[PDB]
Write an enzyme that holds these catalytic residues in place. Structure first.
Site, PDB file in Angstrom:
ATOM      1  N   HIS A   2      52.028  36.162  25.854  1.00  0.00           N
ATOM      2  CA  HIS A   2      50.611  36.480  25.970  1.00  0.00           C
ATOM      3  C   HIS A   2      49.943  36.349  24.595  1.00  0.00           C
ATOM      4  N   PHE A   4      46.958  36.086  23.709  1.00  0.00           N
ATOM      5  CA  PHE A   4      45.786  36.942  23.533  1.00  0.00           C
ATOM      6  C   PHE A   4      46.165  38.415  23.690  1.00  0.00           C
ATOM      7  N   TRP A   5      46.799  38.771  24.814  1.00  0.00           N
ATOM      8  CA  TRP A   5      46.994  40.189  25.107  1.00  0.00           C
ATOM      9  C   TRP A   5      48.004  40.869  24.182  1.00  0.00           C
ATOM     10  N   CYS A 160      34.073  35.663  34.225  1.00  0.00           N
ATOM     11  CA  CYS A 160      34.105  34.404  34.942  1.00  0.00           C
ATOM     12  C   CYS A 160      33.902  33.287  33.917  1.00  0.00           C
ATOM     13  N   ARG A 169      40.774  28.872  26.545  1.00  0.00           N
ATOM     14  CA  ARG A 169      40.840  30.082  25.734  1.00  0.00           C
ATOM     15  C   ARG A 169      39.448  30.658  25.481  1.00  0.00           C
ATOM     16  N   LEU A 170      38.548  30.460  26.431  1.00  0.00           N
ATOM     17  CA  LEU A 170      37.210  31.005  26.381  1.00  0.00           C
ATOM     18  C   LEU A 170      37.222  32.464  26.842  1.00  0.00           C
ATOM     19  N   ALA A 171      38.083  32.809  27.808  1.00  0.00           N
ATOM     20  CA  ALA A 171      38.094  34.184  28.297  1.00  0.00           C
ATOM     21  C   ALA A 171      38.399  35.176  27.166  1.00  0.00           C
ATOM     22  N   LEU A 411      34.093  47.563  42.134  1.00  0.00           N
ATOM     23  CA  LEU A 411      33.339  46.610  42.937  1.00  0.00           C
ATOM     24  C   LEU A 411      33.811  45.188  42.620  1.00  0.00           C
TER      25      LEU A 411
HETATM   26  C1  LIG Z   1      36.141  49.211  24.431  1.00  0.00           C
HETATM   27  C2  LIG Z   1      35.564  47.999  25.208  1.00  0.00           C
HETATM   28  C3  LIG Z   1      36.709  47.087  25.736  1.00  0.00           C
HETATM   29  C4  LIG Z   1      36.083  46.075  26.734  1.00  0.00           C
HETATM   30  C5  LIG Z   1      37.068  44.983  27.230  1.00  0.00           C
HETATM   31  C6  LIG Z   1      38.387  45.499  27.841  1.00  0.00           C
HETATM   32  C7  LIG Z   1      39.310  44.385  28.392  1.00  0.00           C
HETATM   33  C8  LIG Z   1      38.571  43.423  29.382  1.00  0.00           C
HETATM   34  C9  LIG Z   1      39.571  42.501  30.121  1.00  0.00           C
HETATM   35  C10 LIG Z   1      38.830  41.658  31.192  1.00  0.00           C
HETATM   36  C11 LIG Z   1      38.779  42.415  32.542  1.00  0.00           C
HETATM   37  C12 LIG Z   1      38.177  41.528  33.589  1.00  0.00           C
HETATM   38  C13 LIG Z   1      38.074  42.244  34.925  1.00  0.00           C
HETATM   39  C14 LIG Z   1      37.707  41.183  35.969  1.00  0.00           C
HETATM   40  O1  LIG Z   1      36.561  40.723  35.987  1.00  0.00           O
HETATM   41  S1  LIG Z   1      38.832  40.660  37.127  1.00  0.00           S
HETATM   42  C15 LIG Z   1      37.991  39.212  37.773  1.00  0.00           C
HETATM   43  C16 LIG Z   1      38.528  38.023  36.999  1.00  0.00           C
HETATM   44  N1  LIG Z   1      37.734  36.821  37.351  1.00  0.00           N
HETATM   45  C17 LIG Z   1      38.235  35.793  38.047  1.00  0.00           C
HETATM   46  O2  LIG Z   1      39.389  35.790  38.444  1.00  0.00           O
HETATM   47  C18 LIG Z   1      37.315  34.643  38.366  1.00  0.00           C
HETATM   48  C19 LIG Z   1      38.065  33.312  38.499  1.00  0.00           C
HETATM   49  N2  LIG Z   1      38.763  33.004  37.239  1.00  0.00           N
HETATM   50  C20 LIG Z   1      38.195  32.738  36.104  1.00  0.00           C
HETATM   51  O3  LIG Z   1      36.940  32.723  35.951  1.00  0.00           O
HETATM   52  C21 LIG Z   1      39.089  32.443  34.921  1.00  0.00           C
HETATM   53  O4  LIG Z   1      40.424  32.038  35.378  1.00  0.00           O
HETATM   54  C22 LIG Z   1      39.265  33.638  33.948  1.00  0.00           C
HETATM   55  C23 LIG Z   1      37.919  33.952  33.287  1.00  0.00           C
HETATM   56  C24 LIG Z   1      39.753  34.840  34.788  1.00  0.00           C
HETATM   57  C25 LIG Z   1      40.302  33.313  32.863  1.00  0.00           C
HETATM   58  O5  LIG Z   1      39.861  32.176  32.096  1.00  0.00           O
HETATM   59  P1  LIG Z   1      40.802  30.888  32.041  1.00  0.00           P
HETATM   60  O6  LIG Z   1      41.666  30.815  33.258  1.00  0.00           O
HETATM   61  O7  LIG Z   1      39.969  29.720  31.692  1.00  0.00           O
HETATM   62  O8  LIG Z   1      41.824  31.287  30.869  1.00  0.00           O
HETATM   63  P2  LIG Z   1      41.521  31.198  29.296  1.00  0.00           P
HETATM   64  O9  LIG Z   1      42.388  30.066  28.770  1.00  0.00           O
HETATM   65  O10 LIG Z   1      40.049  31.205  28.922  1.00  0.00           O
HETATM   66  O11 LIG Z   1      42.205  32.541  28.779  1.00  0.00           O
HETATM   67  C26 LIG Z   1      43.582  32.819  29.065  1.00  0.00           C
HETATM   68  C27 LIG Z   1      43.864  34.277  28.806  1.00  0.00           C
HETATM   69  O12 LIG Z   1      43.044  35.067  29.712  1.00  0.00           O
HETATM   70  C28 LIG Z   1      43.914  36.030  30.329  1.00  0.00           C
HETATM   71  N3  LIG Z   1      43.374  36.377  31.677  1.00  0.00           N
HETATM   72  C29 LIG Z   1      43.332  35.600  32.773  1.00  0.00           C
HETATM   73  N4  LIG Z   1      42.722  36.262  33.818  1.00  0.00           N
HETATM   74  C30 LIG Z   1      42.335  37.460  33.304  1.00  0.00           C
HETATM   75  C31 LIG Z   1      41.671  38.556  33.853  1.00  0.00           C
HETATM   76  N5  LIG Z   1      41.282  38.589  35.168  1.00  0.00           N
HETATM   77  N6  LIG Z   1      41.427  39.597  33.070  1.00  0.00           N
HETATM   78  C32 LIG Z   1      41.864  39.641  31.798  1.00  0.00           C
HETATM   79  N7  LIG Z   1      42.480  38.614  31.229  1.00  0.00           N
HETATM   80  C33 LIG Z   1      42.735  37.520  31.962  1.00  0.00           C
HETATM   81  C34 LIG Z   1      45.246  35.344  30.399  1.00  0.00           C
HETATM   82  O13 LIG Z   1      46.293  36.279  30.596  1.00  0.00           O
HETATM   83  C35 LIG Z   1      45.317  34.647  29.045  1.00  0.00           C
HETATM   84  O14 LIG Z   1      45.724  35.561  27.997  1.00  0.00           O
HETATM   85  P3  LIG Z   1      47.198  35.595  27.406  1.00  0.00           P
HETATM   86  O15 LIG Z   1      48.031  35.820  28.664  1.00  0.00           O
HETATM   87  O16 LIG Z   1      47.321  34.186  26.895  1.00  0.00           O
HETATM   88  O17 LIG Z   1      47.298  36.759  26.429  1.00  0.00           O
HETATM   89  C1  LIG Z   2      38.773  38.618  51.595  1.00  0.00           C
HETATM   90  C2  LIG Z   2      38.927  38.147  50.176  1.00  0.00           C
HETATM   91  N1  LIG Z   2      38.089  37.307  49.551  1.00  0.00           N
HETATM   92  N2  LIG Z   2      38.549  37.148  48.230  1.00  0.00           N
HETATM   93  C3  LIG Z   2      37.757  36.252  47.358  1.00  0.00           C
HETATM   94  C4  LIG Z   2      39.637  37.797  47.946  1.00  0.00           C
HETATM   95  C5  LIG Z   2      40.247  37.753  46.569  1.00  0.00           C
HETATM   96  C6  LIG Z   2      39.973  38.531  49.173  1.00  0.00           C
HETATM   97  C7  LIG Z   2      41.165  39.454  49.381  1.00  0.00           C
HETATM   98  C8  LIG Z   2      40.803  40.926  49.432  1.00  0.00           C
HETATM   99  O1  LIG Z   2      40.718  41.354  48.078  1.00  0.00           O
HETATM  100  C9  LIG Z   2      40.380  42.610  47.885  1.00  0.00           C
HETATM  101  C10 LIG Z   2      40.340  43.475  48.963  1.00  0.00           C
HETATM  102  C11 LIG Z   2      39.958  44.786  48.699  1.00  0.00           C
HETATM  103  F1  LIG Z   2      39.947  45.679  49.676  1.00  0.00           F
HETATM  104  C12 LIG Z   2      39.616  45.223  47.458  1.00  0.00           C
HETATM  105  C13 LIG Z   2      39.708  44.369  46.381  1.00  0.00           C
HETATM  106  C14 LIG Z   2      40.007  43.021  46.533  1.00  0.00           C
HETATM  107  C15 LIG Z   2      40.055  42.200  45.275  1.00  0.00           C
HETATM  108  C16 LIG Z   2      41.166  41.367  45.013  1.00  0.00           C
HETATM  109  C17 LIG Z   2      41.320  40.628  43.825  1.00  0.00           C
HETATM  110  C18 LIG Z   2      40.282  40.728  42.886  1.00  0.00           C
HETATM  111  N3  LIG Z   2      40.061  40.215  41.668  1.00  0.00           N
HETATM  112  N4  LIG Z   2      38.856  40.642  41.164  1.00  0.00           N
HETATM  113  C19 LIG Z   2      38.231  41.452  42.016  1.00  0.00           C
HETATM  114  C20 LIG Z   2      36.858  42.123  41.798  1.00  0.00           C
HETATM  115  N5  LIG Z   2      36.796  43.473  41.156  1.00  0.00           N
HETATM  116  C21 LIG Z   2      37.444  44.464  41.998  1.00  0.00           C
HETATM  117  C22 LIG Z   2      37.323  43.427  39.794  1.00  0.00           C
HETATM  118  C23 LIG Z   2      39.148  41.589  43.165  1.00  0.00           C
HETATM  119  C24 LIG Z   2      39.034  42.298  44.327  1.00  0.00           C
HETATM  120 MG   LIG Z   3      38.805  28.734  29.131  1.00  0.00          MG
END
Ligand SMILES: CCCCCCCCCCCCCC(=O)SCCNC(=O)CCNC(=O)[C@H](O)C(C)(C)COP(=O)(O)OP(=O)(O)OC[C@H]1O[C@@H](n2cnc3c(N)ncnc32)[C@H](O)[C@@H]1OP(=O)(O)O
Ligand SMILES: Cc1nn(C)c(C)c1CCOc1cc(F)ccc1-c1ccc2n[nH]c(CN(C)C)c2c1
Ligand SMILES: [Mg+2]
Length: 411
Positions: A2, A4-5, A160, A169-171, A411
């Site tokens: 990982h 990043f993490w 997203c 590596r934008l995330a 949510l």
């Molecule tokens: C004090 C304040 C603190 C605030 C912040 C606290 C932490 C916030 C954390 C965020 C909480 C979010 C809560 C939600 O919204 S969960 C909803 C997540 N959104 C999606 O799944 C939408 C569809 N997917 C995408 O848009 C992309 O695949 C994303 C943006 C998810 C990754 O972009 P991409 O696929 O182009 O990859 P990369 O090359 O830029 O980056 C790769 C790195 O990203 C790590 N990765 C992948 N998925 C996630 C994920 N869901 N949470 C955390 N990290 C994630 C991955 O392990 C790797 O790191 P490492 O394994 O190399 O180390």
């Molecule tokens: C139906 C259906 N449509 N989609 C797009 C999924 C992933 C499902 C499966 C059901 O998933 C669920 C069903 C539930 F009762 C509650 C939560 C999810 C779910 C699963 C994966 C997720 N990744 N990011 C989020 C958003 N937020 C919570 C951070 C998620 C929310």
């Molecule tokens: Mg990226």
């Protein structure tokens, strides 16, 4: 593994999480003055943007990015389609901070490429029940109770990256900039959920579904027909009969929540949530925000006899796009939100929720096995689905807990 993490103040392994005995911060303590005012560096073809989440055009920009590029299910068949109204509800709760809504745009054509949002939450996140016992025997109660008071922290959601910029590596850059923005307001922890395994969850729960409209569910491939029903002349009629519900709830007293109910709902909700290890603390204003009915977004009902509210339930709507070319089918899904039962068994209250959702044209009801959600699975004909929602903190060491000790709906 990982890149990043491994750089971040979170537990790095499962074993680490299993050994944690007290709640508490992980990182070096810092002041606001320690944190840079200059935004995190990003490539010159891109720019930070803070959308105004109440401006029509900005919300529309965010809506389209998510509609086209947000979370898909584990089988890549469905994609969340949160409505513009849902986004403004979720992102603009009381005392929200506009600066915690972070976007990346391409400079040349102002194309929105990425998003992440934080919102304030007051969360109880002190040492659990099972962990306070062990530390009593050992007599280390003060360390264990140090962070019992609810903490004003950040909830992260809606991360997203556009499909066309994945794996660049934008995330990590969005996460660092969010972290910086949050730290600038003297907040040091965050809570987040994801359907993927990252380092390292403090709890994890399967999601469950209850068919309301099985015919549609089968057509869009959310469900199949039970083998056992395939053995009959009309498999679909058997399946429909199985999931059939009354058209209205015979639960006398049920009505939509209204503003006058806010105080009693707050009291019965907080009394219930206070029994779980990790859970939100809501003000009146937050009860109002998250639970008062909003057309097509959030639906909430109270059991009230003689102006005394004794129970309530809430659900929200997220439709899922059914992925395919020229496929306008929508999985219209209702998600179990907060609830509290004091006058009737919880299963009776949730049967009413299914009845109402079905009446309002929902196809399925979804939930994660947090709260007391497992207690009504079998009787109400929920089944486990193929996904798991993991719960995480940023900069907070927390012992592993069961999902039935988690009271935060995300949510
Ligand atoms: C004090 C304040 C603190 C605030 C912040 C606290 C932490 C916030 C954390 C965020 C909480 C979010 C809560 C939600 O919204 S969960 C909803 C997540 N959104 C999606 O799944 C939408 C569809 N997917 C995408 O848009 C992309 O695949 C994303 C943006 C998810 C990754 O972009 P991409 O696929 O182009 O990859 P990369 O090359 O830029 O980056 C790769 C790195 O990203 C790590 N990765 C992948 N998925 C996630 C994920 N869901 N949470 C955390 N990290 C994630 C991955 O392990 C790797 O790191 P490492 O394994 O190399 O180390
Ligand atoms: C139906 C259906 N449509 N989609 C797009 C999924 C992933 C499902 C499966 C059901 O998933 C669920 C069903 C539930 F009762 C509650 C939560 C999810 C779910 C699963 C994966 C997720 N990744 N990011 C989020 C958003 N937020 C919570 C951070 C998620 C929310
Ligand atoms: Mg990226």
């Amino acid at each position: 593994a990982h890149a990043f993490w491994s750089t971040q103040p979170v537990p790095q392994t499962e074993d680490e999480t299993e050994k944690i005995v007290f709640a508490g911060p992980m990182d070096e303590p810092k002041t606001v003055a320690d944190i840079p005012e200059e935004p995190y560096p990003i490539a010159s073809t891109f720019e930070w943007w803070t959308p105004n989440m109440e401006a029509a055009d900005d919300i529309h920009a965010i809506y389209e990015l998510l509609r086209d590029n947000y979370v898909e299910d584990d089988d890549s068949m469905f994609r969340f389609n949160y409505s513009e109204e849902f986004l403004q509800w979720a992102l603009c709760p009381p005392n929200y901070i506009p600066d915690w809504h972070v976007a990346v745009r391409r400079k040349a054509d102002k194309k929105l490429l990425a998003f992440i949002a934080g919102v304030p939450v007051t969360l109880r996140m002190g040492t659990p029940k099972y962990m306070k016992v062990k530390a009593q025997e050992k007599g280390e109660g003060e360390e264990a109770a140090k962070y019992d008071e609810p903490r004003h922290i950040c909830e992260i959601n809606f991360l997203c990256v556009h499909k066309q910029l994945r794996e660049k590596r934008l995330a990590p850059i969005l996460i660092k900039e969010a972290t910086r923005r949050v730290n600038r307001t003297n907040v040091w922890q965050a809570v987040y959920t994801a359907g993927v395994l990252l380092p390292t969850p403090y709890a994890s729960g399967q999601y469950f579904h209850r068919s309301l409209n099985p015919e549609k569910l089968v057509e869009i491939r959310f469900s199949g027909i039970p083998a056992q029903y395939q053995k009959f002349q009309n498999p679909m009629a058997m399946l429909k009969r199985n999931y059939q519900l009354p058209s209205a709830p015979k639960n006398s007293g049920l009505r939509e929540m209204k503003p006058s109910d806010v105080p009693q709902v707050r009291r019965i909700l907080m009394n219930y949530l206070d029994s779980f290890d990790v859970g939100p603390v809501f003000s009146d204003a937050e009860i109002s925000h998250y639970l008062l009915p909003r057309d097509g977004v959030v639906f909430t009902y109270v059991v009230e006899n003689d102006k005394k509210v004794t129970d309530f339930f809430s659900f929200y709507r997220i439709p899922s796009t059914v992925i395919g070319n020229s496929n306008y089918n929508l999985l219209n899904a209702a998600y179990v939100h907060y609830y509290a039962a004091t006058s009737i068994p919880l299963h009776q209250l949730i049967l009413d929720l299914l009845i109402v959702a079905h009446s309002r044209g929902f196809d399925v009801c979804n939930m994660v096995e947090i709260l007391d959600n497992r207690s009504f699975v079998e009787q109400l004909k929920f089944g486990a689905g193929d996904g798991h929602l993991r719960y995480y903190f940023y900069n907070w060491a927390y012992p592993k807990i069961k999902p039935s000790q988690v009271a935060l709906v995300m949510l």
